[PDB]
UniProtKB/Swiss-Prot annotation, chain A:
The keyword Nucleus applies. It comes from Homo sapiens (Human). PROSITE patterns: MPN. Disulfide bonds: none annotated. One of its GO terms (biological process) is protein deneddylation. Residues 183-288 are annotated as: Interaction with Vpr. This is COP9 signalosome complex subunit 6. GO terms for cellular component: COP9 signalosome; cytoplasm; cytosol; nucleoplasm; nucleus; perinuclear region of cytoplasm.
Swiss-Prot record, chain D:
It is found in: Cytoplasm; Nucleus. It comes from Homo sapiens (Human). This is E3 ubiquitin-protein ligase RBX1. The chain holds residues 49 to 108 of 108 of the full protein. GO terms for biological process: cellular response to amino acid stimulus; cellular response to chemical stress; cellular response to oxidative stress; cellular response to UV; DNA damage response; MAPK cascade; negative regulation of canonical Wnt signaling pathway; negative regulation of insulin receptor signaling pathway. GO terms for molecular function: cullin family protein binding; molecular adaptor activity; NEDD8 ligase activity; NEDD8 transferase activity; protein-containing complex binding; RNA polymerase II-specific DNA-binding transcription factor binding; ubiquitin protein ligase activity; ubiquitin protein ligase binding. It is an enzyme of class 2 (transferase).
Swiss-Prot record, chain E:
It comes from the Eukaryota. This is Cullin-3. The chain holds residues 693 to 766 of 768 of the full protein. Brain, spermatozoa, and testis (at protein level). Widely expressed. The gene is CUL3. It is linked to Pseudohypoaldosteronism 2E: An autosomal dominant disorder characterized by severe hypertension, hyperkalemia, hyperchloremia, hyperchloremic metabolic acidosis, and correction of physiologic abnormalities by thiazide diuretics. Neurodevelopmental disorder with or without autism or seizures: An autosomal dominant disorder manifesting in infancy and characterized by global developmental delay, variably impaired intellectual development, and speech delay. Some patients have seizures, others have autistic features or behavioral abnormalities. Additional variable features include cardiac defects, failure to thrive, or brain imaging anomalies. It is found in: Nucleus; Golgi apparatus; Cell projection, Cilium, Flagellum; Cytoplasm, Cytoskeleton, Spindle. The lineage of its organism: Eukaryota, Metazoa, Chordata, Craniata, Vertebrata. Residues 6-68 form the Cullin neddylation domain. It comes from Homo sapiens. Changing residue 27 to R: Found in a patient with autism spectrum disorder; uncertain significance. Disulfide bonds: none annotated. Belongs to the cullin family. Neddylated. Attachment of NEDD8 is required for the E3 ubiquitin-protein ligase activity of the BCR complex. Deneddylated via its interaction with the COP9 signalosome (CSN) complex. There is a cross-link at residue 20 (Glycyl lysine isopeptide (Lys-Gly) (interchain with G-Cter in NEDD8)).
Curated annotation (Swiss-Prot), chain F:
Belongs to the CSN1 family. It comes from the Eukaryota. The PCI domain is necessary and sufficient for the interactions with other CSN subunits of the complex. Mediates the interaction with CAPN8. It comes from Homo sapiens. The chain holds residues 405 to 467 of 491 of the full protein. Widely expressed. This is COP9 signalosome complex subunit 1.
């Protein structure tokens, strides 16, 4: 077993969408080049402030399989290290990433070589063949444990977060707006209401968890979890919200405005269809 | 097949580069398809900049009348927007970057250059035009991409343009819709001038697995409050501009039709008028679907939250 | 909100009087106290009448309307005044911003509650995992 | 003479080392660079004399 | 040397004032107007004015909108 | 009253107290009213055109 | 003295006394009296300005040329004080402005009418109740007008095209 | 520091009790900061006070936990006389209960439920409650309204657990109904797309048939 049991995260890891973007692109191209989903290996860079680690960017590494062992071209990694120096100074190496499922007895070999380079590398593994609705990205750290009298390096899962800036947020929001359309338009409202469906599902799952906790407290658990059940009941008392004449008036105002806009759009489509029909009819029987 | 575009066919690219069909037509390249990765990287770099122009190189390929951008990378250069062919200062760097990229399986070569216009739209100035002209003198298939990171944020819609220059002495044909941009006083003067000067490439893009990963992750959490109001279209600048352009286009169509009623036997005029009317109708329609989807999301969510029980 | 008993300690510290060489502009203390009391008024009060505002500031309503007028002119306090009714409309976030902020605060409080149950009660996290695996 | 102008107010908020200095004319008068810039667009006659207000210095 | 330096900034004072919002200078087009304006003055100095329009780095602090030809200038 | 009938005064006459009150109509209400009128006229013209197409396709004309 | 009055008349917002006048031509006794006038002009102290005019009338409007321009100068400064003051408090009673300006109510009404007709005031006057109602223009519209114009113009366009093609 | 002071008194209540506990509870009602009294009520020594001879302080504490100011006015004979701090704290709690139901509170309701005569002191009490981070909101004086955006919650007598369960069940049922409606919209949109594709393929088949005919 390469996974440590009972070991909690010692540092906080912040991940950016660009890192996941690099991993996905690396896996796709290698799959396209060599058929099956060939495992990819790259490196992680970013800023580290004490125990707070922020992974802002990531890049690829050259590796070779010799004696059924993955040998990372650290010389290429070092050649690429000064290459990224020429563009960015504030970004420092933080760890390496790969693709696959559970850790295999080859990633430990990769990690020990990366641990040789720097003081403390971070290990990230992405699962491109996942089927659940959760993020198939996990961050692991290096821990030394005495197993059967021998010091064996293990991986401890880290409770990383997803940190992003206003820029990236707006950018990917409009990337989703652009995916809402396309050359091969299958459906648009389908994707829209599927997105709302996923959001409502997340909220419903939260409500189910709260209700289950309340029922358990009624049965066992803590009879009163203090501020938690207090705030839960208060929020359930704010569920009605209560609108005023002005809010309903403004809601109906916006609805009427955009409905009039929709009516105008339907009129435009209908008049275009009428123009096409008239153009065809003027050729069907009419002259001049 | 969603991932078919990611397949690189080197011999096919060599065949296209030997054929040079763009020499037969200065309007040959009409479409620009951009991957998610490239666009995201570019936007991020430009916003880190903040109010200063940055630039980089785009890696990709060609496919018929379509230019395809697969990836991009920043260039460590000074004088973007002031120096003609500023990219030249990064020549050595570009050679090494690409060499190292080829070592890790990046097979696509240089397809263009991108740079930012923070808060002044997306167009080609006299300098940009000189640079892209030189970039289309030695590397004819080159696309210039311009991004406004500031207007992207303020408008809530990606502000990007793809452009190609005309050779010295060559005049554009009759068509040129030219969407108006709110560039500053003298910047807009020069903008009208260079919109008359170059030609834009229809933004096409492609939904892929890169896009699938992004849309899914950001919507889950950055949109825990999937609210974000619901109408970033409330700003009467984009929809209003589209409405005004629609009105101008249909007014010009009517003006053409009125004069065309006296000439008996002009089929081309009828064809052009019908096509213009159809294009205007589709533009208005797509605006209508956008508004309707916005209102639908708004209605469902606000009804649920305000009056669930 | 600043009342009239904090004046004594601050005034003594300033310059055994007021920090400069005296203030005499109704004291720079009270000028800032009134100015802050208008900011604190701007945070809550959607609108305010002349008499009620003046009693809050411990000044005549004629003084209250003038300083509020001055702050609006300088842009340090948003709003408008109506002299007929004698009421100053400080701030109202229409209907959409208020609703959006309320929804965002509700979602943030829900997330805080979920995090608190997960942290303070890991047994709840185990029970939730068991329940989601059962169903 | 220093300490910013009416068009700039505070020191920070996108100043980049405060790109607003004092400008000197041939008539030896001194004002802010931005203040005369707004003056020079409408009129051009150096409101303290009747010299044409050449540009002889930047900063103090 | 002083009068030669006087020539070198007077052309730049004139160039950023005239090609500000006149016609179009894609390459060496509107520059002929400035040479005609300074024809009765001194030599057109083509090479000098051609490297000095790009050499508008008079602000070392800069860190703001760069000197894009005459757009940044008044 | 003559000026209001001709226009360019945009006012209403209150003959009770003899006070001339200016008219400031809501843009949105007039816009919605005339948009509904335009839609009704468009539907009527569409019906007219469909009837014209029906009578032309079936060759209906007075001999 | 003529130049200082001329600088006032052009509604200039720059101290003419600053440096060329320096002190010999900024603190000369009668010139210093003129310095107080432009100082009140900068501060828009209408009450103080009129007090100095009446105090030094033997050297203020003594010149027949200046005496002609005192009425216009008073009109301008009263307008500037009015324009500066009226920014807040829409729907103000007229007599309050008259007391603040220390002038008659009829003069305030005439000045208000001139300011509105110059497009400097976004509002109208209620002469029945002695009231000045200012348009707050908080609707934030002017786009529905463009939408309606576009709708009507292009729908008439479509109707004309259909009629001509049929 | 109210929570730390609350916990210290909880630890002290585990030991010393009686008249000292009642005086300690009175100090809690007088010391500003404490806005939640549910944790105190669940101490075993509070239950010891239930069977104890003294009940005025317990009925006092019980009212602060569940009752409001008008109930306290009704019980001015069975409750120990409060201080100025105790009265203000109860008035803040009553405002919390009022703000919990309605997010907009007219000044008429404020003057009625709280025995408020002078409107000036009403504003002073409102701002005092807000500045101690009790209620977040906005005051409308032209309409004489109190718009409260956010407020702290209150305690439960374990009989509202059924109401909480019912509310959560209603929320779950509404969410499930919206999910089912969204799925029905999926089906309807897919059916419309299929109908459009059927029309397109019918047109293509008709065109191909005519091409074969000629
Ligand atoms: Zn550019
Ligand atoms: Zn400045
Ligand atoms: Zn000067």
């Amino acid at each position: 077993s390469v996974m440590a049991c009972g070991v909690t995260g010692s540092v906080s890891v912040a991940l950016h969408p660009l890192v996941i973007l690099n991993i996905s692109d690396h896996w796709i191209r290698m799959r396209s080049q060599e058929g099956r989903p060939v495992q990819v290996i790259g490196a992680l860079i970013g800023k580290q402030e004490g125990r707070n680690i922020e992974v802002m960017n990531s890049f690829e590494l050259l590796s070779h399989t010799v004696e059924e062992k993955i040998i990372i071209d650290k010389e290429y990694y070092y050649t690429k290290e000064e290459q990224f120096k020429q563009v960015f100074k504030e970004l420092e190496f933080l760890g390496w990433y790969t693709t696959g499922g559970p850790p295999d007895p080859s990633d430990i070999h990769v990690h020990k070589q990366v641990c040789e380079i720097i003081e403390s590398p971070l290990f990230l593994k992405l699962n491109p063949m996942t089927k659940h609705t959760d993020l198939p990205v996990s961050v692991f750290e290096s821990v030394i444990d005495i197993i059967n009298g021998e010091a064996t390096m293990l991986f401890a899962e880290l409770t990383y977060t997803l940190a992003t800036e206003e820029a990236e947020r707006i950018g990917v929001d409009h990337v989703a707006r652009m995916t809402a359309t396309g050359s091969g338009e299958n459906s648009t409202v389908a994707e829209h209401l599927i997105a709302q469906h996923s959001a409502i599902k997340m909220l419903h799952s939260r409500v189910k968890l709260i209700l289950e906790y309340v029922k358990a407290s009624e049965a066992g658990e803590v009879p009163f979890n203090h501020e938690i059940l207090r705030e839960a009941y208060a929020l359930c008392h704010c569920l009605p919200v209560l609108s005023t004449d002005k809010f309903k008036t403004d809601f109906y105002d916006q609805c009427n405005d955009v409905g009039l806009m929709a009516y105008l759009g339907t009129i435009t489509k209908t008049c275009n269809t009428m123009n096409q029909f008239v153009n065809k009819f003027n050729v069907l029987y009419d002259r001049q | 097949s969603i991932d078919e575009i990611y397949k690189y066919d080197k011999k096919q690219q060599q065949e296209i580069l030997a054929a040079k069909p763009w020499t037969k037509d200065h309007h040959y390249f009409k479409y620009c398809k951009i991957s998610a990765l490239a666009l995201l990287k570019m936007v991020m770099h430009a916003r880190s900049g903040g109010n200063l122009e940055v630039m980089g190189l785009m890696l990709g390929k060609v496919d018929g009348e379509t230019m395809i951008i697969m990836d991009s990378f920043a260039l460590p250069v000074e004088g973007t927007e002031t120096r003609v062919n500023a990219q030249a200062a990064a020549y050595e760097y570009m050679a090494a970057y690409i060499e190292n990229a080829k070592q890790v399986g990046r097979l696509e070569n240089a397809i263009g250059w991108y740079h930012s216009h923070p808060g002044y739209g997306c167009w080609l100035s006299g300098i940009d035009v000189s640079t892209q002209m030189l970039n289309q003198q030695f590397q004819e298939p080159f696309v210039a991409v311009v991004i406004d990171p500031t207007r992207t944020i303020s408008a809530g819609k990606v502000n990007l343009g793809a452009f190609r220059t005309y050779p010295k002495g060559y005049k554009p044909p009759d068509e040129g819709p030219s969407e108006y941009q709110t560039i500053p006083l003298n910047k807009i003067e020069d903008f009208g001038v260079h919109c008359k000067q170059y030609y834009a490439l229809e933004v096409s893009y492609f939904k892929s697995s890169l896009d699938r990963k992004l849309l899914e992750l950001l919507w889950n959490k950055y949109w825990v409050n999937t609210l974000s109001s619901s109408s970033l279209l409330t700003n009467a600048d984009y929809t209003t501009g589209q409405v005004f352009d629609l009105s101008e286009k249909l007014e010009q169509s009517e003006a053409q039709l009125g004069r065309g009623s006296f000439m008996l036997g002009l089929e081309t005029h009828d064809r052009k008028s019908e096509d213009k009317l159809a294009k205007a109708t589709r533009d208005s329609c797509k605006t209508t679907i956008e508004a309707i989807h916005g209102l639908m999301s708004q209605v469902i969510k606000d009804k649920l939250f305000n009056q669930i029980n | 909100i600043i009342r009239g008993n904090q004046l004594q300690e601050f005034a003594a510290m300033l310059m055994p009087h007021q920090k400069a060489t005296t203030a005499d502009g109704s004291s720079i203390l009270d000028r800032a106290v009134i100015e802050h009391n208008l900011l604190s008024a701007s945070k809550l009060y959607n609108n305010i009448t002349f008499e009620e505002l003046g009693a809050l500031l411990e000044i005549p309503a004629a003084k209250a309307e003038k300083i509020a007028s001055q702050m609006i002119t300088e842009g340090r306090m948003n709003g408008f005044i109506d002299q007929i009714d004698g009421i100053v409309h400080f701030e109202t976030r229409e209907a959409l911003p208020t609703w959006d902020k309320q929804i965002q605060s509700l979602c943030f409080q829900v997330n805080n509650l979920l995090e608190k149950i997960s942290q303070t009660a890991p047994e709840w996290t185990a029970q939730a995992m068991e329940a989601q695996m059962a169903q | 003479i220093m300490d910013l102008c009416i068009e700039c107010q505070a020191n920070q908020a996108s100043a980049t080392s405060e790109e607003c200095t004092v400008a000197w004319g041939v008539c030896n008068h001194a004002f802010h660079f931005h203040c005369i810039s707004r003056w020079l667009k409408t009129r051009q006659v150096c409101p303290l004399d009747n010299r044409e207000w050449e540009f002889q210095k930047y900063g103090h | 040397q002083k009068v030669d330096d006087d020539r070198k900034h007077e052309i730049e004072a004139a160039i950023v004032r005239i090609m500000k919002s006149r016609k179009k200078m894609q390459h060496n087009v509107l520059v002929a107007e400035v040479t005609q304006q300074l024809k009765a003055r001194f030599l057109p100095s083509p090479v000098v004015i051609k490297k000095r329009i790009e050499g508008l780095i008079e602000r070392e602090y800069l860190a703001r909108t760069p000197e894009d030809r005459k757009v940044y200038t008044y | 009253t003559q000026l209001i009938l001709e226009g360019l005064i945009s006012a209403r006459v209150d003959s009770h107290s003899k006070i001339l009150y200016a008219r400031d109509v809501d843009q949105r209400s007039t816009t919605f009213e005339k948009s509904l009128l335009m839609g009704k006229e468009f539907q009527r013209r569409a019906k007219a055109m469909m009837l014209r197409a029906a009578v032309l396709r079936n060759q209906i004309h007075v001999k | 003295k003529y130049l200082v009055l001329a600088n006032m008349l052009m509604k200039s917002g720059i101290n003419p006394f600053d440096s060329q006048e320096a002190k010999p031509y900024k603190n000369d006794p009668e010139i210093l009296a003129m310095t107080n006038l432009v100082s009140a002009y900068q501060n828009n102290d209408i009450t103080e300005f009129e007090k100095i005019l009446k105090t030094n009338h033997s050297n203020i409007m003594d010149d027949p040329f200046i005496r002609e321009h005192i009425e216009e100068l008073l009109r301008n400064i009263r307008t500037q004080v009015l324009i500066k003051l009226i920014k807040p408090y829409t729907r103000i009673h007229i007599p309050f402005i008259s007391k603040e300006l220390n002038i008659d109510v009829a003069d305030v009404e005439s000045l208000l009418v001139q300011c509105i007709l110059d497009n400097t005031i976004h509002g109208r006057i209620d002469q029945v109740n002695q009231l000045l109602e200012l348009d707050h223009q908080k609707r934030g519209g002017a786009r529905y007008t463009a939408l309606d114009k576009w709708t009507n113009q292009l729908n008439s366009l479509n109707q004309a095209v259909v009629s001509k093609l049929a | 520091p109210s929570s730390n002071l609350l916990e210290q008194f909880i630890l002290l209540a585990k030991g010393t009790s009686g008249s000292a506990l009642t005086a300690l509870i009175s100090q809690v009602l007088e010391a500003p900061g404490v806005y939640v009294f549910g944790e105190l009520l669940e101490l075993a020594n509070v239950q010891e006070l239930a069977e104890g001879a003294n009940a005025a302080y317990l009925q006092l504490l019980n009212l602060f936990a569940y009752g409001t100011y008008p109930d306290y006015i009704a019980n001015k004979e069975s409750l120990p006389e409060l201080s100025t701090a105790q009265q203000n704290k109860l008035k803040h709690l009553t405002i919390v209960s009022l703000a919990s139901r309605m997010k907009c509170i007219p000044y008429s309701v404020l003057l009625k439920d709280l025995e408020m005569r002078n409107l000036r002191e009403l504003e002073d009490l409102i701002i005092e409650a807000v500045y101690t981070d009790i209620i977040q909101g906005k005051l409308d004086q032209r309409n004489q309204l109190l718009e409260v955006d956010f407020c702290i919650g209150r305690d439960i007598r374990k009989k509202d657990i059924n109401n909480i369960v019912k509310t959560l069940h209603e929320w779950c049922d509404g969410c499930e109904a919206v999910l089912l409606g969204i799925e029905q919209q999926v089906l309807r949109a897919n059916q419309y797309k299929e109908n459009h594709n059927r029309t397109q393929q019918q047109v293509e088949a008709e065109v191909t048939n005519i091409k074969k005919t000629l």
